C-alpha cells in the first residue's frame with residue numbers, strides 16, 4: 001500500500017502541501033477570496049529531486065524505443081540532479097550511467113554522482129561543451145545511449161504524465177502552476193497537461209536570472225528571479241513553512257508569491273501550485289541559507 | 298489523494314522499499330527462502346528524518362497534557378534531527394522552539410536549526426545541555442521541555458505510526474532493525490511489532506563504544522535514555538563507524554538510497570541479521586529504518602575515501 005519492491009515505484013505521488021502561513025490569503029474572507037500557495041514537494045522523490053520523474057521516464061522511454069538493452073550505458077551531460085536521478089534510475093534499472101561534466105565541476109557534485117554509482121567523464125568552456133562533449137561521445141560510441149535531458153520529450157512527458165495529473169488530482173481548483181525552468185520539462189509537461197484540463201490556468205515560469213523541449217505556447221508568464229530573491233524566499237519558506245527547499249524553489253516561491261500578490265491585489269481567487277523541485281540539504285554547503293543575502297554563490 | 302493543508306499532514310506513511318540488490322536473497326529459491334531487507338524511508342518526512350514523528354507526537358501530547366498553551370515555547374536540549382523536526386513542528390503548530398545545545402556545537406547544526414526558526418541557547422563544557430534546558434524549563438511556566446529522551450510520546454509516535462505502518466506494509470515482517478538514539482523508534486515500533494507479530498525480532502543497531510555514529514548512542518556510553526526498555530529489544534548489533542559509513546555508501550551505491558550514517562549502522566545490523574537468516578535457511582523480511590538522508594552528512598566527508606575516522 002505504501003510498500004514498494006523498488007525505490008523506483010516510490011516515484012512521484014509527491015505531496016502537495018498548502019503553505020497556510022506563506023499564502024497571501026489562506027482562507028476566503030470578508031477581505032476577499034483565498035490566495036493559496038500549494039507546494040508540490042518533489043524532493044519526496046527517490047533521489048530527492050523532481051528529476052527522478054524525467055530520469056525514469058527517459059530511461060523507460062529509451063527502453064520502449066528499444067534504444068536501451070540490458071546493461072547498456074546511459075551517457076548524460078549532467079552534474080546535478082538529473083545525474084543523481086539517472087544514477088539511481090539507471091542502476092536500479094540494470095543500466096550503467098556515465099555523466100559527462102566539465103573538469104571544472106565541484107568535487108561535491110561529482111563525489112555525489114560517484115556515490116550514486118555514475119561513472120564520470122570530463123568535458124573541458126562550460127556546460128555547453130559537456131552537452132557538446134556528450135553529444136560527440138554519444139556519437140563516437142553507439143553502445144552509449146545519451147538520453148539528453150534537454151531534448152528528450154520523455155522529460156516533458158514525465159510531467160505530462162505525473163506531475164500534471166498528480167496536481168490536477170490534488171488541486172482541481174488550481175489556477176496557477178509555478179515551476180522553475182531549466183530543462184523546461186516541468187513547465188512544458190505539467191504545463192501542457194494543466195492547459196488541456198483546466199481553462200485559464202496560468203503556467204508560470206520561474207527563471208532564475210532555447211531549451212530543445214521548450215514550447216513558447218505553453219507558458220503564460222515568466223518571472224525572472226534574482227538570486228537574492230531566491231535565497232530569501234527559500235529562507236522564508238523553511239523559516240515560515242518548515243519546508244527546506246533548494247534554491248530553485250526560492251525562484252519559484254518568488255514567482256508564486258508574485259503571482260499570489262497580484263491575485264490578492266486583484267481580489268481574484270488563486271490556488272497556486274508551485275514546485276519544490278528539491279530540498280535545501282544539497283545546498284547547505286553553498287552557505288546560502290546562513291548569512292548575508294550577499295551571495296557570491 | 299496526497300493533498301495536505303500543512304506539511305504536518307505529510308508525516309509518516311513513509312515508503313517501505315525492498316532492497317532487492319542488497320538483500321541476502323530477494324527471491325525465494327527452491328533451495329532457500331528469501332531474506333529480504335525492506336527500508337522504511339523515514340527521510341521522506343517533512344524535515345527529512347524520522348524525528349518528525351516523535352517531534353509532532355511530543356508536541357501534540359504536550360498539547361494534550363495541557364502542558365503547552367498557544368505561542369508557548371518548546372525548550373529542547375537538542376542540536377540534531379529532533380531539533381529540526383521540532384523547529385518545523387513547533388512553528389507549524391504555532392509554538393516557538395528554543396534548542397539548548399553546547400557552545401561547542403558546529404555552526405552547521407546551529408545554522409540549520411536557526412534556519413528552521415529555532416532559537417538557540419548554548420549550554421557549555423550534551424549532558425549539561427539537558428540540565429540547562431530542564432533547569433531552564435523549570436523556571437518559565439511557559440517554557441515546556443519536551444525531553445525526547447524520556448517523553449513517552451516519542452516512543453508513542455512509533456507505537457502509533459512507524460510500527461503500524463510497517464506491519465501494514467510488511468505483515469510478513471520478521472525483523473525490525475533501527476538505530477538506538479533516544480530509543481523511541483525501537484521502543485515504539487518495537488513494542489508494536491512485538492504485540493502484533495509473534496517472534497518478530499527487534500534489533501537495535503548500536504554504535505560500538507567509542508565509535509560515534511550520528512544520531513545513534515551506545516547504551517553503555519552515556520546516560521541510558523529514560524525511554525529505553527531492554528525487554529523490547531531482541532538483540533543489539535554493535536556497529537563500528539566504518540561499517541556504518543561503508544554501509545551507507547553501499548546502500549546508495551547498490552540501492553540508490555542516500556541515507557544518513559545512522560542508516561548504515563542499521564543496514565549493517567540488518568545485513569548481519571540477514572546473513573544469519575540466509576545461512577540458517579530461514580525466511581527473513583527485515584525492515585530497517587532509514588532514519589534520514591545522506592544530504593546532511595555530505596559536509597562530514599563521510600561519503601569521500603572510506604578511511605576518515
Ligand SMILES: *Cc1c(COP(=O)(O)O)cnc(C)c1O
Pocket residue numbers: 049050051081082180181182183184185186187246248249277278
Ligand atoms: C531540474 C530542476 C529544475 C527545473 O526544471 P526543469 O524541468 O527542467 O524545467 C528546477 N529545480 C530543480 C531542483 C531541478 O532539478
Ligand SMILES: *Cc1c(COP(=O)(O)O)cnc(C)c1O
Pocket residue numbers: 346347348377378379476477478479480481482483511512513557559560588589
Ligand atoms: C534519532 C535518530 C536515530 C535513533 O532514533 P531513536 O528514536 O532515538 O531510537 C537513528 N538515526 C537517526 C538519523 C536519528 O536522527
